[PDB]
Amino acid sequence: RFSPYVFNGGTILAIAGEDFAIVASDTRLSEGFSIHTRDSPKCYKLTDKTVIGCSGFHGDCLTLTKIIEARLKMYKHSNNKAMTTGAIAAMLSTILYSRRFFPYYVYNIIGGLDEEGKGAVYSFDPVGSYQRDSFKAGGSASAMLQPLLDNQVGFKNMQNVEHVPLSLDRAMRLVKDVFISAAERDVYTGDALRICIVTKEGIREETVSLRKD
């Protein structure tokens, strides 16, 4: 009989900097044991200071993206201003709970700048609970990225090591190293790496190739 859900894969990474935010994802879209395309990024520029990532079931990712982009315009003409980073995370929690008994199969991470100019990363669940974190990794390779970033960013289980804040250039090579190691052991990850950098001067993009198998 008909089943309404299917898994598509994907891996999303976000790191809250001191005055920046980095959002990274792969561009591989798959289903079962087939590859649909090798060019399908998960980054979405909502505003000039907020980028969202959407993994999971791809049909709900296309729907939920267009609902949020409609409500950005509905906020603005009612208030003569744009939404903040924390306002979007409060709005998204009500949208995800609004279909509590038929849930979206989407994992969400919002990264961007606050009103003070600092980094902010909000992680989500498919029902709508959230919290502010410093770094999260969502998607199929989520278990292969969280223990390594605890060592390098959070400095957990380390002795006699000072807590220097992560610079921008050091954070770029940490993102480029975790996706090489994750594409080796995971099958839902590869073919590119789209990286979005959110600073006070706009949004930069950068693409790094991976292995194509």
Binding site: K66, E69, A70, K73, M74, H77
Partner: protein, 238 residues
């Protein structure tokens, strides 16, 4: 005088007076002038103060990234049509993932305003909408009326004493297709200064200018950015 009570009642001359009276509410509001070139469509309005120290009431309001409208008439019918206007613009973005053609959005307004001009229980909308936009075939200047007719035009002025603005537009409409924005805007606001009593001048605090372009999103300038537009003007020949 007994025929002059409802929208339903026809006259023995064949003219419904309630539609004829909603035209008179358009003449209560202030004047506003819209025009276009081959590439750029600019509509310019005129603010009116309420008191000596209250803020001036706004006229031009943003609708979409390629559509902006002016206003003349009742403020109750103004925001009631705006909420119908904004809902239709984002439905084509949500369904078709394209912006609306401007010529077919206004046909939805004439279907919207037709029902309260025929069925009893709702007055006609007293409103004077001027519409500027961009479909795939260039700029457009549209007007509506409470008789639910919509007129495509290349220049139009409606509101209080706007007949003197129409006379300026007819003898300069041959020049509008070629000139660019540095004078096309101040071709338009030379038409507003005949809709004024001859002793005061169009200042920076009582005028709004909205520009939508072929490569330019619809932008509203008011009270600070009008000064690069009001520079380089002559006075009235008094």
């Amino acid at each position: 005088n007994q025929y002059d009570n409802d929208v339903t009642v026809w006259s023995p001359q064949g003219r419904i007076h309630q539609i004829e009276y909603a035209m008179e509410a358009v003449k209560q509001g202030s004047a506003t002038v819209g025009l276009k070139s081959k590439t750029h469509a600019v509509l310019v309005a005129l603010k009116r103060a309420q008191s000596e120290l209250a803020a001036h009431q706004k006229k031009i309001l943003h609708v979409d990234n390629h559509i902006g409208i002016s206003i003349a008439g009742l403020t109750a019918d103004a925001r009631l049509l705006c909420n119908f206007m904004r809902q239709e613009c984002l439905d084509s973005r949500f369904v078709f993932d394209r912006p609306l053609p401007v010529s077919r959005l206004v046909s939805l307004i004439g279907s919207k305003t037709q029902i309260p001009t025929q069925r009893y229980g709702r007055r006609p909308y007293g409103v004077g909408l001027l519409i500027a936009g961009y479909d795939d075939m260039g700029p457009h200047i549209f007007q509506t009326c409470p008789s639910a007719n919509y007129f495509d035009c290349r220049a139009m002025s409606i509101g209080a004493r706007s007949q003197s603005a129409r006379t300026y537009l007819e003898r300069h409409m041959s020049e509008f297709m070629e000139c660019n924005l540095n004078e096309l805007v101040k071709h338009g606001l030379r038409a507003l200064r005949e809709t004024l009593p001859a002793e005061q001048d169009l200042t920076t605090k009582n005028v709004s200018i909205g520009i939508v372009g072929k490569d330019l999103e619809f932008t509203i300038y008011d009270d600070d950015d009008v000064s690069p537009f009001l520079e380089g003007l002559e006075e009235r020949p008094q």
